[PDB]
C-alpha cells in the first residue's frame, strides 16, 4: 500500500535487511536465501533488539501502577478507563515487539473494575434518590461495559494508522463464572456481533478465543452454557471466537490454568518462579525459524526416486542448522539494556521490573521465554517420501529440541508457523529448483503444518479427527480449522463441531463464509465471479458495496 | 534515545535524507548543507510526499461520517465517544503528515456531543423518577465532559509509543459562550491544572491556545471572565494556555473568526472556496525553508566590516534560492494520489473528499494551502549590520513573497520558525566559517526570528512593546513570549501581562518556572545546580523524584 505510515515501515525494513545480512553468519542467510529455513521477521531482527510475542501482564499493570511516559498511571476507578488504559497499553506493546500482543481473560482481570462501576452507580443511587437501586446500577454498569469493550474495538481498530506491520491483537476470556466475568464476556461478544461502523462490518481484530470447559460452558446446563451459545452466534456472524478446550489445553502446556496464545498461535509451556508459582502473563517468545520440511524431502531425492538415507543426513544437518540460526538471534540479545523499551522490562508489560541498565536477556533465561522452532506442509512432505512420517519426524524434532533446551536452558518448542506468506515463498524457491512437482509445488503453495490439504475432501469429524493428534505433538504452536457452509440459522450444526474439536484437540476455530451486502442486507454467501464477488439476491458486484470475509490462511481478509 | 519506535524511525530517516540527496538539485543541498539556508523535515520530504501542518475538519468529520479504516464511523452520540474519536483522528493525522496537527475550537466544535449527553441524562430521569431532573443531568454531563478530556489527555499522552518525532497536537478554544461551549472550556482547563498521574507532572502535549476577546472573557464583567481566570490559574500551574488577541488575530489574517495556529504558530491567512465562502478548518502548509539571516550578513563583511553592498547582492540571491528550494518540494507532489492518506484527502481531515485517484496536489493551489519561507536571529543580525533592520528586512521579504504568490498561486508566506534546534545548528556551521564571533555565535546559538535576545535585561511589557509590531510582518508565523517568576499567587500580575499583549500583539505566551517536589510536595522554583536541581524547602535532589518544566525554546521540556 502507498499510505505513508507503511512506506515509512518498509523503509525501516529494509535498512533492517541489509544489517542482517551483516550480522548473520553466511550459511544461514544463504539457507535462507534459498528457501531451506525461514528466519522470520529479518525486517526487524536481529538489526535491532525486538521480541516476538507475548502475553501482556495487564493484570500486574493495573493493580500496582505503572509509568506510561513519564505519567504514574493509578488503578482503574472504573471499567471503561480500565479498557481505555488497556487499549493505551495496547498501544506501546505493539511499538516494542514485532509479533502479536495478547491479553488473557480480560473477564477475570478487569471483573475488578466492572464492580467498581457498579459501586458508583449504587452511591448515585443512594443520593439523587434512585427507584429501583440494584435494577438501575444494574443498568448502567452493564451498558458501562458495553461501551467500554466497544471503545477498545475502535481503538485497536485505529492502530492501523501504525502499518507497522498491523498490529495483531488477542484476547481471551471463558473461564470466568461471576456475573462481572460474564457481564465482560456478553459484553465482548455483543459487540462483536454488532460489527464496525454503520454497515456493522466484520473486524478483523482483536481475534477472539473463548475457553470451553465442562461445568462451566460446555454442556446445556453449565452456568455460562447461555454465552456458549451467544458465542455460537458470533462465530456465525463475525468469525471469531475461536475456542480451545481447557481440558486438553492443560494436558499440553502442563499448566494449571488454561493457556492462551501469544498472538496467533504460540503456545507457552509451563514455568515457575524462584518461590514455585506458576507464572504465565508477562511472558514471551524470542523468535522463529522455520525448517521447509518438503524442501529436506525434495533434496533427498536421485533422479526421480526419494533416497531414505539422504533425508536423514539432511534432516540431521538442517535441524543442527536451525538450532544455529535460533541462537543466532538470541545472542543479538545479550547486552542490550531495558532502556530500549520500557513499558516491557521497566514497568509492568513482562510481569517484572528492571532497572534501566539492566540486561533485558536474563528474563528469558531458564525455561521462561519460549524461542519456536516451526515447520511447514507435512502434507507435501507425506506425498514425497511416501508413506505418512507427520506424527514421527514432528516426534524426531521435539527430541533434538529437548536437548537444545537442555544445553542453553532455553524453553525450544515445536511451532506450527502460520506461513501466510511463506506457504507461497517456499514453493516458489522450491519451484525454481525442481520447478512443476505434481502434487507437491504444482498449485502453488504447501499446506500448513499437519493440515489435511485444503483440497481433500472428508467430513469435519474425519478432519478434526485427523488433525487431533498433532496438538499434542507441536506444543509450541497449533490450530485446526474446518469448513462448514453458513451455519447462521444451523448453530446447533456448529456447536456440534465444536463439541467434537473441544474433545479431541486444543486450539480449534471454524472458518465459514461471512458476506453482507451492503445494498440489498444480505448476509447470504456471496457468489464467486472471474471478476469478483456477485450478490445472489442482489446483483451488487461494487466491492465498495459489501463486506466479504474469509479466513483463507491465518487471518480474516478480504479475497 | 535507545527506544525502539525511535530507532526505526532514524532508520527511515536516513533512507530519507539519502533520497532526498538524488532528488534535490545539487546547489540547494550544497546551500542546506553549509548552513546557508534549511530545508526542513528533509528526513520526511521529499522522499515520500508528506505534507507538513494543518487544521483538522473535525467539525466536518463527525456531522458527515468518514471512513477510518473500513469501518464507517457515524456522528459521535455522546460527548465521550467524540473525544474518543477525535484522539483517534488524530493518531491518524499525525501517521501521514510530519507537521503538528490542531484541532481549532474544540468547545463550538464538541458543543453538538455535550447537549446530546444532557439529552441522554434527562430521558434517564424521566426513566428512573430523578429527583432533580435538571440539577442531576447537569451534574452527570458536566462529569462526562471532564473525564472525556482526562481521557484525551492520555491518549495524546500514549501517542509517544509512535515517536516517529513526537505527535505536536494543538487544541484551542475561549470564542465560546454556551454553557456547553463554557462546560468544554473548563473541563479542559481543569483537567490540565490537575496534571498527570499520581504526581499530577505537567503535560507536554496537547498544547492549549485561548483566544480573548472584549465581551466574551477579556474584562471582569465578560460572559467567560471566570474562564479567564482559570485559564490564569491554569498558566501559572501547567504553563499553558498561550493566548490569542482575537483582535489582532483577525487583523493579521484578515479573517471574520479568530485563525488558530496549525501546530505551534503556523497561521494561515483567509481564502474562500469557489462559492465565496471563508474556510479555515482542513487547510494546511506545505513544508518549510529557513533563511539564515546572520549568515547574510557574515557573508557581507569585507575583513572586519560590514559591506552594504554585497549584503543587499547575497540578500536578493539567496531570496531566490529559497523560493527555488520551496518549489523544489512543491512540486515532488506534481502526480501523487490520494491512495497515499485516506483520512487526508479521502475522508474529512483536509476538508473535501478526493476519489482515490485524484491528484492530491490540486487541493493546496490557488492559496488555500501555505507555504513557509522562514528566518532566524534578526537580533544577531541587527549586531553584524549596525543598525536595526528588523522590520525593513522583513518587509522587503514579504514584496518578494507576494511575486512568488502571483507567478505560482502558492500562498508563500513569512513564517518565524520555532528552530528549536536549528538555533544552534546555524550558528554551528556558521562558526566552522568565522568561529567565535562577539555577540553573534559566541554564546552558541541564535536568537528566535524577531525575539529580543533572551539576555536583554527589559521590563515584560517593554518586550512585548517591542516584539509587537513583528507580529504584524510575519503574518505566516510568530509568538512572543516574556519570563516571569512564580506567579501562582500574583495571578493579577499575570493577568496584568495577558491583557497587554492581548492588546498590542496577536499569539502570546508567557512562561515561567512550573516545579514540583514529590517528595516534600512544594510547587516552589527549584534550586539550580552544577549537578541538577535541588529543592529549597526539602533538599531532594534526585530527578526521579521531581517534575521541573521549563519552556526554553518552543516546547515545554525538562532541563
Ligand atoms: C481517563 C484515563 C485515565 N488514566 C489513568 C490516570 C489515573 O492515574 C488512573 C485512574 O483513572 P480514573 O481515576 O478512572 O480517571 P477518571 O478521573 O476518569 O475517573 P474518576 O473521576 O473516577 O477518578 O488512570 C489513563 O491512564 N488513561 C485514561 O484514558
Ligand atoms: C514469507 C514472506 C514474508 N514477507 C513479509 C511479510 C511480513 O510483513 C514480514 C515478516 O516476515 P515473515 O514472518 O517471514 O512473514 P510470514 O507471513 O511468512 O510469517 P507468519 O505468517 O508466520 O507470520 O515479511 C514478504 O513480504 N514476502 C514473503 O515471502
Ligand atoms: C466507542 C467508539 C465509537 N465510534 C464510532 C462508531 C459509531 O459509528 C459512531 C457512534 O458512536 P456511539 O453511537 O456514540 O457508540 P456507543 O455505542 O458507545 O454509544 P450509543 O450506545 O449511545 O450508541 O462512532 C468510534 O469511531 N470510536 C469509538 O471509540
Ligand atoms: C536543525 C536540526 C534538526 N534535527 C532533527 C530534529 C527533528 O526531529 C528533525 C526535523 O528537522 P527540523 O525541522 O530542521 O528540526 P528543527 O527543530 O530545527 O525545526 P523546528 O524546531 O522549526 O521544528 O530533524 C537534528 O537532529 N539536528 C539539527 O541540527
Ligand atoms: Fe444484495
Ligand atoms: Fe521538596
Ligand atoms: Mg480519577
Ligand atoms: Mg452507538
Known amino acids: 500500500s502507498r499510505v505513508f505510515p507503511t512506506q515509512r515501515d518498509l523503509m525501516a525494513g529494509i535498512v533492517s535487511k541489509h544489517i542482517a545480512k551483516n550480522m548473520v553468519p553466511s550459511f544461514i542467510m544463504k539457507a535462507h536465501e534459498s528457501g531451506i529455513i525461514h528466519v522470520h521477521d529479518i525486517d526487524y531482527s536481529p538489526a535491532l533488539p525486538f521480541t516476538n510475542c507475548c502475553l501482556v501482564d495487564l493484570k500486574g499493570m493495573l493493580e500496582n501502577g505503572f509509568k506510561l511516559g513519564n505519567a504514574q498511571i493509578e488503578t482503574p476507578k472504573s471499567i471503561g478507563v480500565a479498557?481505555?488504559?488497556?487499549?493505551?497499553?495496547?498501544?506501546?506493546?505493539?511499538?516494542?515487539?514485532?509479533?502479536?500482543?495478547?491479553?488473557?481473560?480480560?473477564?477475570?482481570?478487569l471483573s475488578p473494575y466492572v464492580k467498581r462501576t457498579y459501586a458508583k452507580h449504587i452511591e448515585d443511587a443512594e443520593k439523587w434518590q434512585i427507584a429501583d437501586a440494584l435494577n438501575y446500577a444494574q443498568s448502567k454498569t452493564e451498558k458501562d461495559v458495553y461501551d467500554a469493550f466497544q471503545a477498545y474495538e475502535y481503538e485497536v481498530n485505529t492502530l492501523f494508522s501504525s502499518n507497522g506491520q498491523t498490529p495483531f491483537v488477542t484476547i481471551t476470556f471463558g473461564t470466568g463464572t461471576d456475573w462481572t466475568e460474564r457481564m465482560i464476556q456478553k459484553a465482548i461478544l455483543k459487540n462483536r456481533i454488532k460489527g464496525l461502523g454503520r454497515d456493522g462490518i466484520t473486524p478483523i481484530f482483536p481475534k477472539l478465543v473463548m475457553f470451553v470447559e465442562e461445568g462451566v460452558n460446555l454442556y446445556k446446563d453449565d452456568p455460562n452454557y447461555d454465552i456458549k451459545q451467544l458465542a455460537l452466534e458470533c462465530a456465525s456472524?463475525?468469525?471469531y471466537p475461536d475456542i480451545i478446550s481447557a481440558?486438553?489445553?492443560?494436558?499440553?502446556?502442563?499448566?494449571?490454568?488454561?493457556?492462551?496464545?501469544?498472538?496467533?498461535?504460540?503456545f507457552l509451556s509451563v514455568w515457575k518462579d524462584s518461590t514455585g508459582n506458576e507464572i504465565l502473563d508477562g511472558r514471551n517468545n524470542l523468535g522463529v525459524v522455520t525448517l521447509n520440511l518438503p524442501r529436506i524431502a525434495l533434496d533427498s531425492?536421485?533422479?526421480?526416486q526419494f533416497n531414505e538415507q539422504k533425508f536423514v543426513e539432511l534432516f540431521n544437518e538442517r535441524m543442527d542448522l536451525c538450532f544455529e540460526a535460533l541462537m543466532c538471534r538470541i545472542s543479538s540479545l545479550k547486552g542490550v539494556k531495558a532502556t530500549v523499551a520500557p513499558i516491557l522490562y521497566q514497568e509492568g508489560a513482562f510481569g517484572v521490573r528492571l532497572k534501566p541498565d539492566d540486561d533485558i536477556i536474563e528474563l528469558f533465561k531458564n525455561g521462561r521465554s519460549s524461542?519456536?522452532?516451526?515447520?511447514?506442509?507435512?502434507?507435501?512432505?507425506n506425498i514425497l517420501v511416501g508413506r505418512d512420517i507427520g506424527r514421527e519426524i514432528l516426534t524426531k524434532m521435539n527430541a533434538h529440541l529437548k536437548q537444545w533446551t537442555e544445553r542453553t536452558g532455553f524453553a525450544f518448542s515445536l511451532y506450527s508457523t502460520p506461513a501466510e506468506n511463506l506457504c507461497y515463498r517456499f514453493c516458489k524457491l522450491d519451484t525454481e529448483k525442481y520447478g512443476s512437482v505434481k502434487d507437491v509445488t504444482d498449485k502453488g503453495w504447501y499446506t500448513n503444518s499437519f493440515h489435511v490439504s485444503v483440497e481433500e475432501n472428508i467430513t469435519?469429524?474425519?478432519?478434526?479427527?485427523r488433525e487431533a493428534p498433532y496438538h499434542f505433538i507441536a506444543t509450541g504452536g497449533h490450530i485446526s480449522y474446518v469448513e462448514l457452509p453458513d451455519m447462521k440459522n444451523n448453530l446447533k450444526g456448529l456447536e456440534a463441531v465444536w463439541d467434537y474439536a473441544a474433545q479431541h484437540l486444543d486450539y480449534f476455530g471454524v472458518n465459514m463464509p461471512v458476506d453482507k451486502?451492503?445494498?440489498?442486507?444480505?448476509?447470504?454467501?456471496?457468489?464467486?465471479?472471474?471478476?469478483?464477488?456477485?450478490?445472489?439476491?442482489?446483483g451488487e458486484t461494487d466491492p465498495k458495496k459489501m463486506?466479504?470475509?474469509r479466513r483463507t490462511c491465518a487471518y480474516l481478509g478480504n479475497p
Not at 93 to 104: D, E
Open 371 to 381: 524461542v519456536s522452532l516451526g515447520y511447514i506442509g507435512i502434507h507435501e512432505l
Open 460 to 465: 469435519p469429524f474425519e478432519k478434526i479427527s
Open 547 to 549: 463486506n466479504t470475509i
Open 83 to 109: 479498557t481505555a488504559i488497556m487499549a493505551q497499553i495496547t498501544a506501546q506493546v505493539a511499538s516494542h515487539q514485532y509479533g502479536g500482543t495478547t491479553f488473557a481473560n480480560v473477564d477475570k482481570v
Open 301 to 304: 531425492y536421485i533422479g526421480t
Open 237 to 239: 456472524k463475525r468469525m
Open 247 to 266: 481440558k486438553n489445553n492443560k494436558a499440553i502446556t502442563g499448566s494449571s490454568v488454561p493457556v492462551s496464545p501469544m498472538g496467533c498461535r504460540s
Open 517 to 538: 451486502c451492503f445494498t440489498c442486507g444480505s448476509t447470504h454467501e456471496m457468489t464467486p465471479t472471474e471478476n469478483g464477488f456477485v450478490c445472489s439476491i442482489c
